[PDB]
Design an enzyme around this catalytic site. Sequence first.
Site, PDB file in Angstrom:
ATOM      1  N   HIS A  63       0.323   6.601   0.067  1.00  0.00           N
ATOM      2  CA  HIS A  63      -0.005   5.343   0.156  1.00  0.00           C
ATOM      3  C   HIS A  63       0.649   4.593   1.536  1.00  0.00           C
ATOM      4  O   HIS A  63       0.967   3.274   1.457  1.00  0.00           O
ATOM      5  CB  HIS A  63       0.429   4.334  -0.892  1.00  0.00           C
ATOM      6  CG  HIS A  63      -0.248   4.853  -2.348  1.00  0.00           C
ATOM      7  ND1 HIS A  63      -1.321   3.935  -2.845  1.00  0.00           N
ATOM      8  CD2 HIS A  63       0.223   5.713  -3.193  1.00  0.00           C
ATOM      9  CE1 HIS A  63      -1.539   4.618  -4.128  1.00  0.00           C
ATOM     10  NE2 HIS A  63      -0.776   5.733  -4.393  1.00  0.00           N
ATOM     11  N   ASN A  70      -3.397   1.485  -9.536  1.00  0.00           N
ATOM     12  CA  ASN A  70      -4.566   1.868  -8.519  1.00  0.00           C
ATOM     13  C   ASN A  70      -5.902   1.206  -8.825  1.00  0.00           C
ATOM     14  O   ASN A  70      -6.012   0.269  -9.853  1.00  0.00           O
ATOM     15  CB  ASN A  70      -4.663   3.339  -8.725  1.00  0.00           C
ATOM     16  CG  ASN A  70      -3.642   4.340  -7.871  1.00  0.00           C
ATOM     17  OD1 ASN A  70      -2.972   3.768  -7.025  1.00  0.00           O
ATOM     18  ND2 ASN A  70      -3.553   5.506  -8.234  1.00  0.00           N
TER      19      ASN A  70
HETATM   20  C1  HEM Z   1      -0.584   6.575 -12.717  1.00  0.00           C
HETATM   21  C2  HEM Z   1      -0.211   7.270 -11.474  1.00  0.00           C
HETATM   22  C3  HEM Z   1       0.242   6.699 -10.235  1.00  0.00           C
HETATM   23  C4  HEM Z   1       0.027   5.580  -9.664  1.00  0.00           C
HETATM   24  C5  HEM Z   1      -1.009   4.267 -10.143  1.00  0.00           C
HETATM   25  C6  HEM Z   1       0.546   5.123  -8.324  1.00  0.00           C
HETATM   26  C7  HEM Z   1       0.522   4.231  -7.648  1.00  0.00           C
HETATM   27  C8  HEM Z   1       1.319   4.058  -6.298  1.00  0.00           C
HETATM   28  C9  HEM Z   1       0.954   2.857  -5.397  1.00  0.00           C
HETATM   29  C10 HEM Z   1      -0.027   2.016  -5.624  1.00  0.00           C
HETATM   30  C11 HEM Z   1       1.943   3.197  -4.291  1.00  0.00           C
HETATM   31  C12 HEM Z   1       2.208   2.462  -3.147  1.00  0.00           C
HETATM   32  C13 HEM Z   1       2.866   1.103  -3.480  1.00  0.00           C
HETATM   33  C14 HEM Z   1       2.695   0.328  -2.278  1.00  0.00           C
HETATM   34  O1  HEM Z   1       1.908  -0.540  -1.907  1.00  0.00           O
HETATM   35  O2  HEM Z   1       3.897   0.189  -1.613  1.00  0.00           O
HETATM   36  C15 HEM Z   1       2.499   4.292  -4.588  1.00  0.00           C
HETATM   37  C16 HEM Z   1       3.598   4.958  -4.203  1.00  0.00           C
HETATM   38  C17 HEM Z   1       4.375   5.961  -4.308  1.00  0.00           C
HETATM   39  N1  HEM Z   1       4.351   6.863  -5.228  1.00  0.00           N
HETATM   40 FE1  HEM Z   1       2.839   6.705  -6.875  1.00  0.00          FE
HETATM   41  N2  HEM Z   1       1.205   6.406  -8.164  1.00  0.00           N
HETATM   42  C18 HEM Z   1       1.078   7.166  -9.316  1.00  0.00           C
HETATM   43  C19 HEM Z   1       1.650   8.528  -9.417  1.00  0.00           C
HETATM   44  C20 HEM Z   1       2.877   8.864  -9.025  1.00  0.00           C
HETATM   45  C21 HEM Z   1       3.791  10.113  -9.232  1.00  0.00           C
HETATM   46  C22 HEM Z   1       3.508  10.949 -10.433  1.00  0.00           C
HETATM   47  C23 HEM Z   1       4.737   9.906  -8.461  1.00  0.00           C
HETATM   48  C24 HEM Z   1       5.983  11.080  -8.541  1.00  0.00           C
HETATM   49  C25 HEM Z   1       6.515  11.530  -9.517  1.00  0.00           C
HETATM   50  C26 HEM Z   1       4.599   8.986  -7.374  1.00  0.00           C
HETATM   51  C27 HEM Z   1       5.513   8.742  -6.437  1.00  0.00           C
HETATM   52  C28 HEM Z   1       5.220   7.742  -5.633  1.00  0.00           C
HETATM   53  C29 HEM Z   1       6.100   7.525  -4.375  1.00  0.00           C
HETATM   54  C30 HEM Z   1       7.457   8.501  -3.951  1.00  0.00           C
HETATM   55  C31 HEM Z   1       5.817   6.401  -3.602  1.00  0.00           C
HETATM   56  C32 HEM Z   1       6.449   5.972  -2.514  1.00  0.00           C
HETATM   57  C33 HEM Z   1       7.111   4.396  -2.783  1.00  0.00           C
HETATM   58  C34 HEM Z   1       7.794   3.972  -1.810  1.00  0.00           C
HETATM   59  O3  HEM Z   1       7.923   4.748  -0.696  1.00  0.00           O
HETATM   60  O4  HEM Z   1       8.181   2.829  -1.569  1.00  0.00           O
HETATM   61  N3  HEM Z   1       3.470   8.381  -7.806  1.00  0.00           N
HETATM   62  N4  HEM Z   1       2.170   5.116  -5.913  1.00  0.00           N
END
Ligand code: HEM
Lengths: 323, 679, 682
Positions: free
Chosen positions: C65, C138
């Site tokens: 993202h 999402n």
């Molecule tokens: C239902 C499943 C998931 C949803 C709805 C989701 C949603 C999101 C969203 C919207 C962001 C961006 C937030 C922003 O705008 O700054 C994000 C970032 C991220 N996601 Fe997920 N994600 C999912 C699954 C996962 C999983 C399974 C992992 C790891 C185990 C993960 C790891 C990350 C990481 C590391 C970031 C970066 C956060 C940052 O750098 O501040 N995500 N995710």
Amino acid sequence: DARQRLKEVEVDDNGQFMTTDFGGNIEEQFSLKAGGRGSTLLEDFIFRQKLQHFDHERIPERVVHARGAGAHGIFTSYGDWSNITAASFLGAKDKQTPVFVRFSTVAGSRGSADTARDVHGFATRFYTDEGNFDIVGNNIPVFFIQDAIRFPDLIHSVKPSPDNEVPQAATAHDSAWDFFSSQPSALHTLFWAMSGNGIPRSYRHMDGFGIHTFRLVTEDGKSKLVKWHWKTKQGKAALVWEEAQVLAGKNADFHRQDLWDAIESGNAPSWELAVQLIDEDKAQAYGFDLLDPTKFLPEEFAPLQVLGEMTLNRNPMNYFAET
Amino acid sequence: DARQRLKEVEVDDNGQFMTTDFGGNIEEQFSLKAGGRGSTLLEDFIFRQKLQHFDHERIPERVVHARGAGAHGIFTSYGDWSNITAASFLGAKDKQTPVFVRFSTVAGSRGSADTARDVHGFATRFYTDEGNFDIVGNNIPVFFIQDAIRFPDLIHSVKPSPDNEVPQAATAHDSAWDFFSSQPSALHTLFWAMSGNGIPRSYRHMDGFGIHTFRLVTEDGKSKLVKWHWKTKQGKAALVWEEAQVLAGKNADFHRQDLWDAIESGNAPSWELAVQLIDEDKAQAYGFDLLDPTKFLPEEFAPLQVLGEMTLNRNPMNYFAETEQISFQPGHIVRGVDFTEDPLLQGRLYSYLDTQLNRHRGPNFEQLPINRPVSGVHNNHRDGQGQAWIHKNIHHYSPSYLNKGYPAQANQTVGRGFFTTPGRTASGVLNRELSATFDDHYTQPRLFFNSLTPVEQQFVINAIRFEASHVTNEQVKKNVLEQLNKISNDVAKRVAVALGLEAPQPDPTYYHNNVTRGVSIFNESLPTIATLRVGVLSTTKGGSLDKAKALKEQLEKDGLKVTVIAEYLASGVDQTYSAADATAFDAVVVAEGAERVFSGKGAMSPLFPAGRPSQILTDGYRWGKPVAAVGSAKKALQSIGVEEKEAGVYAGAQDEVIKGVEEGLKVFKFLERFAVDGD
Amino acid sequence: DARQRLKEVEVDDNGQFMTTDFGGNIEEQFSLKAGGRGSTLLEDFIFRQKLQHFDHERIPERVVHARGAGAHGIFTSYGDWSNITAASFLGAKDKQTPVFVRFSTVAGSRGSADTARDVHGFATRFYTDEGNFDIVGNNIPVFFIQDAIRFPDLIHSVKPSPDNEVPQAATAHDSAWDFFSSQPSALHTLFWAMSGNGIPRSYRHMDGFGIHTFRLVTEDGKSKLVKWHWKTKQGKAALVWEEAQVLAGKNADFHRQDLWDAIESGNAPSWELAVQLIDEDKAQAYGFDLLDPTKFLPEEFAPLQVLGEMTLNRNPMNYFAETEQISFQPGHIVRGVDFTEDPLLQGRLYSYLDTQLNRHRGPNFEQLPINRPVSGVHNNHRDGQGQAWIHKNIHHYSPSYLNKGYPAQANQTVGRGFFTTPGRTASGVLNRELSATFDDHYTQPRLFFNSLTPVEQQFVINAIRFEASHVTNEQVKKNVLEQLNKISNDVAKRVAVALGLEAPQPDPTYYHNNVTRGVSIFNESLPTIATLRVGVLSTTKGGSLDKAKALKEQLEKDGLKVTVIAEYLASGVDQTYSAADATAFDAVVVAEGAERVFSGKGAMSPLFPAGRPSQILTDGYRWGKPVAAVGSAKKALQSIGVEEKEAGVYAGAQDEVIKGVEEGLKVFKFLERFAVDGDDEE
Ligand code: HEM
Ligand code: HEM
Ligand code: HEM
């Protein structure tokens, strides 16, 4: 040679010309100047690459056990222990495994005295043919607290007062004894640190302990509860407090020097690796809970079984790069 | 209140419930577990946010001067000094500026002892209304090396040996004396570090120096060369080495605790700021080049002109956030001050900015509360790790029509801008050399040694004897002796005795008999005895304790900090013999009746190590302190073979003892008790 | 003003002289040189302090993202919801809480196009008076995988190939479809991303989902399972793929500009917060396991219940300090909410805290102004890189006599502390497995495909056809076809045509005809046309511009953003033909007289590329937009072969065109213009 695998990263500068970090021979004893008594030029890349590396030499010290010293060696297994564990490094009589061991105090920062009164670290890495296995132990068999979430409270109370950062490497201030009396689980380790375990004669004269009950597991899944023990072949020996205090000033490096000297002189120290083995259904049978790290298991209930021996016989070449 | 501006960032936790770092109240004394004796759950966000912050508490220590302590205060200018500088904090009589000062050793890591022998840092920030101005100085007026490119070589040689990291906070090893003798420029600062300046009694008893020649610049661009000086209002005072060694063990925090207590008790220390002012055409007029930081300017040629005074009267509230995080730079310069072509200063300007990138892991360290100026920051810098502000000006560039020309340019004539001294010129070839004017490394070391008292000279020779005897390599020791011989044949002969080497033949090229003022410590008694410490040795048996209290209450009337010592913490007892040591005190006096703990059964007790009261008095005497006993306690002096006839030894009734000890504290050290070569 | 709390950190440089970062006025337009044509001096402290700050400007982008944009706003609860949750921000009718929302794609790096085909992030922070509550969601209700340990595998396969770092911001390559066919749980999110959800018209035209089942917990500890829903008040709207591709080149900032423009113009977007609530004893009662994040809950089983409304009405002042630096975490939870044993959710709690250490290089990132709570931070945490506070309590530990017990412990009954749902239990063996209740990977993808309109289904098949035809490995393509055939035999056969592969035999284990509401985009017209954009094609010769100015004025009265286009920036012209493209508009209207630029001399001009007016009208038509011509401008429609009585084509006088175009903007896309499989048969 326990350090055998590290020879490929060793760099010999004898007989060479000075270079930058990107190659090319140089001189680096004079800055480039605009005239005889002039200002230093920004275009002196030699000055800046050399000073940039110096300016960036330091990394954060460990949050605890910042003061310590280590050495390389070999562990040898006395038997095929496959009946209690599938661990490869215990899988055959006379099987040899490289080790590195770091010894330490706990509270003091990088430059504090070896002979402060403290718990002492005793961390061993086995470089086994099935991965690295660390026993991250202390020289005292029990710990101050019963739940990891309390570690910052314990450490904050023992480390220096946050207003003036006094006292260095010492529990003899208000906050520490406030915590010890407010969190009585701490009394057991406290008594150990107040004994000779808190001021050992040297690293070579300490036992070591894993503290926690772990499990040993065979190929088919049979498990036993285990306590790890390092038994020094040099014998346990301690100082007295009024001598430790003067030694902290006459030679802050007393223990790391002692280890270095013993190895260099060919008097490599050794320890036996030993275990207490407990059945799973006896985890609560000895008057305490074996998941409780503020308790040790008296040897009268479970005598030590000797698995093998470790000898530390090579000093590091570069303290920073290794220790 | 010098810390006033810091109030808006202070966090009060009194009466509060515990939270995470993102809000919401919590409990954080139990991990969340799957069943009663179960494993800890990954979904325990409380545990992980708490331990992550703990896990990441440490930042790299400073590459040099890692061990140090500091305090807040106020600088006051004594005049309108616009005739010599445009610098705003010196621009009006009685004008006040907040400061912060950090004192330090150099070689040792964090946690090494305060009373290691070393050069000491003395670094001052002025939070002026035209920016932060740092004088990043030492307690010694000269430095080891003439070109900044050599600093890693100096530092590597002095810091622990890189194979085993031995020894901590010490120059007494092969590599350091190999460098000192291979790089003879280092001999001047070495002699200072081997004098009392290497083992000062406290931060408050040090002078300070900018070392380098700088420039003071008026509004029209006229310049004067300038040396900065801090003159302690407390007087200079030093330990002896055999005392500093024990103190390093008995109290590694001796100097930071001393500063803290002085401020807490309302005895704020002070320094006058003074300058030597030199016309530009006299840069090479005094037997050396004022661009050369291995030389100082004798006060006979340029007296110290007092400009103002600084008083440190506020301790920090959080050591890490204030003292550990503050980032000094010699490049923190303001309008009215400029640099010189000193090749050591020149490279410092690069190194201090660059090194903050390591220590703070990002470019925004000037936004930390302790680093912020009070005067306002307006530029087109943006982003970077940890950016703490939100900038309003979209047009973050210059020049620009869209931002209307703001932030605007400032120079000598508009906006009180910084400007380089208008008359400075460059001339000659681009070179990797040093001026031949830098080549004399022996005259000023000899000048310094000449200007010390005879026992003070013996302290220097004994420091060298102690240190050089640790060098295992025979040839390095011969090289040291060859270099010392170029300063003084007599110094070389006296050192060579300890090393078992032959007295070399005189090498008189640089020998001379000149002396200069203001470099000695022990030739001057202290101007005050306030905050100095008296150990009163007593006992809980009999009526000694009531007398010790009477003695204490009188000594405190003169501003002394008095510690009554006894076998246990009876009423009126400040410290036990078990916890006590002579290194903590500036004078030791045995209260009447306490002679019973200096021999016999009174000296044999489970409550303190055998002989401890006698050791405290023996130490105090042999380290040159005023020592005393009231009445019958004179027997304690006899038990260690000390007689009342001696200087700095006082016996008799209470009032005579108080008067003697209080006069003895101004002498501070009684040099009669230290043997001199051939005496 | 939702940004009010940030006013204390704002720096105003107008009317000021330039300074260094440590104060003192300076000039910084010339380096200090040794002589007139001399080398630059190391003692130029002004140069180095300025360039050091520049050299260190960048921080790591988010690992996923990375590409997105955000805004501040206000959330208003519609009632006192204490009967289902102790959450404070839901505790009283008309209670207002500031928010920040960041929308995003997933795969592309920081500088990739907004209209790439991708899942889209929808992350909301509630700055509640009991801590920060984040719903990190999402625009699609289901996720690719069932266990968080598999997240690096999914993301590696979708992100660019690690040898040449190709392709950017796309799943149309071998490794992605190798993963989708090798890890069949991925097929459900795949179908959603192959639909309109993959190419939304704007952030404002997206629904949002928390995806996971969470728990709401009352004061006495009673719990209900919950799914979070954001329902856009602007309506769902999507592009078509061939248009989104051109838009990625003509304006990579299309979505972030759209949002910024909506807010600057006073047309703040809103979404309603809605929940589904499920009894704990019915977690496995709806044909799947509610701990499975690859499934959604049909609204026919549990209808949406609206709790409040969120409106985004303030743009950031500095994008980097606010939008780039903000650190969302699903572990940002508050009293009244709790987790479930969803194995995907479980690992996210660890991941988002840990990744902040990489992006912010230190543990104090919650001290940044955009991350700070409004409710107060009181604990024994100390030190760390960039520590911005000065703590007064010197007894930084618990338990303690010396600090009188403060800061004090807070739990369920004392100090309104967080507490885990009281009834939750653990039972059985420690295992590295997945519940067999998770095993069905095909039924809900089939349910989703069944619930789209015919042309909407064709868009899905055409996206798969487009993507799978980039796969060079023959067996991967056959693997994809076998998996698609487990969802629908007709889908597999229609995809296989494009791939030149054999129509597979029916494999009917998971086939079914069930449908559900609320997943389509194109079966519902928009509830408003405010902020939608009309391009008015005009010309500088004759009277066209005057008429175009009157057309724009009337259209603006209805809330439309109108761009008048002509050869050069004459009076009343907003944009040149050279600068214009159909992708920037939702409707294209030819002003009377502008037929001159659609053929003959007026069409070949040095001021714009050859054919550009014709191309804009052709794209607008073929991409499904309302298109119109006033008066004699009907020849422009004739010149591209468009008939005047077609659906979504309006010709006539000014007033009839305005009315027709405003009606057609509600339909938004005219799907009669897209052929479906079987149409071309003879
Ligand atoms: C239902 C499943 C998931 C949803 C709805 C989701 C949603 C999101 C969203 C919207 C962001 C961006 C937030 C922003 O705008 O700054 C994000 C970032 C991220 N996601 Fe997920 N994600 C999912 C699954 C996962 C999983 C399974 C992992 C790891 C185990 C993960 C790891 C990350 C990481 C590391 C970031 C970066 C956060 C940052 O750098 O501040 N995500 N995710
Ligand atoms: C049985 C109880 C414990 C023992 C025997 C123990 C032992 C040790 C030892 C020997 C070291 C130094 C290893 C080295 O020489 O590099 C160390 C470091 C450390 N310990 Fe522990 N410790 C215990 C409890 C804890 C707890 C409860 C925590 C936190 C939850 C903790 C966190 C740390 C950390 C963060 C380090 C720094 C390691 C590094 O930076 O490499 N310790 N401990
Ligand atoms: C006249 C000669 C020198 C003096 C008086 C001096 C003094 C000092 C002082 C007092 C400090 C400690 C500041 C504090 O308390 O935080 C310090 C630190 C430091 N010095 Fe120097 N020094 C000199 C030479 C040099 C040279 C030649 C270099 C390199 C070219 C250098 C590089 C450094 C660095 C990198 C630090 C650490 C700064 C930080 O991390 O904040 N010094 N010096």
